[PDB]
Amino acid sequence: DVPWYLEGDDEYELLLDVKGNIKGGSKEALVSHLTHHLSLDSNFNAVFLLMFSSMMSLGELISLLIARFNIEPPEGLSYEEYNLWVSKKRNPIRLRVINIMKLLLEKNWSMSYYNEPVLRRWLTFAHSDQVQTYSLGNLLVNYLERLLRGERIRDPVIPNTKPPAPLTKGSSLSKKPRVMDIDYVELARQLTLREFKLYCKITKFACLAKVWGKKSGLSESIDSITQFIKASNQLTNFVGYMILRKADPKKRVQIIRYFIQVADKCRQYNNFSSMTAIISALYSSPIHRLKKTWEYMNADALSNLKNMNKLMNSSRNFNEYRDVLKFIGSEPCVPFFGVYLSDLTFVYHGNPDYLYNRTRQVNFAKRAKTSEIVSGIDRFKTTGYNFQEVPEIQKFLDAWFEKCPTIDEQYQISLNLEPRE
């Protein structure tokens, strides 16, 4: 067994579940467990480093970590007992503390964490003789110095396969081209390229900042998300407006079937963001009420649209979508980002930030659930899409995405295009 002075620290302030896993604890207890000298929990360490700002500030974490590095022995130890305490507890704790700081800087750093007094205290710590005897001491100094002068401490892979030839040469399109002058497969490719580029800019920190808000402890910009949501709203506005610009119902039905084919080709490309944005416009009130136009729709196109709507049934928890996303793997994919947000929003509002309303009993299990959800967004940044970009179509989409009115404003256009009886 272990002598009494070589046991863990602050463990009486940990709270465990049925399986024995940590469900909660105090700031001191959680950090003590993060730098435990006897055992190492990689899963705990990963969840804590990702979610720590929702539980404590950077300055509190650094202070608690430095206090662990400078841990004092309990009073009354004999000289021999103290030497054993140094070799078996303090020095292992110092290794854990330094390695945790390395992981914090290398894999769990948000620029919003920047705090010059904390960094300068941290830097002073890294300069200390006791830290400099470790090899990582010079690396800690190098990281903190770069963070202090504004420097930053990845891209999805594209296979060596030949890209498919673009189905619509940009030079063949007129200066003011019609949408259906673009091959629907090629439009799906270009929608997939712009959506995936916007998707890869979304960090986990931005997701935590959008859902948790001020409790996240992240002043990170959610601009990556707002641009991604803007692109989906614009694609939905664009789809409805291209339909409502056509005056002949026999021409509106061709535009709709064109967009059904686009959304379906996006589904084949594992681009569920653009596909959901397209069908949401088709099911929107201004387009859904075009009874004279849908009378022309072939059963084949209607089935494909219904199947895509069954796939992304929000009222049925996206059940079929979840079953399909589970088997993507290494294939490139633009997921429907709305599912991540709702999952995160559900666990943020369904679980308390504290256990039994005790401020010193932080609900760590709530952070663990959130960590498992938000970490999924990285699964689909591993491999990118091998599609040749057509700038003429990219500029064409940029122009219309800004010009189109909202779906709500398009309701009046629908009422004039097909009046009520």
Curated annotation (Swiss-Prot):
State whether keyword Cell division applies: yes
Gene field: CDC25
Q: Which GO terms describe its molecular function?
A: guanyl-nucleotide exchange factor activity
Q: Name one GO cellular component term.
A: plasma membrane
Ranges for domain N-terminal Ras-GEF come to: 18-152
- What is one process in the GO biological process aspect for this record? cell division
Full-protein positions shown: 883 to 1306 of 1333
- State the organism named in the record: Candida albicans (strain SC5314 / ATCC MYA-2876) (Yeast)
How is this protein named in the record? Answer: Cell division control protein 25
**Where does the source fall among the domains of life?**
Eukaryota
Ranges for domain Ras-GEF: 183-420
Q: What are the record keywords, sorted? A: Cell cycle, Cell division, Guanine-nucleotide releasing factor, Mitosis, SH3 domain
Please give the function described in this protein's UniProt entry: Promotes the exchange of Ras-bound GDP by GTP. This protein positively controls the level of cellular cAMP at start, the stage at which the yeast cell division cycle is triggered.
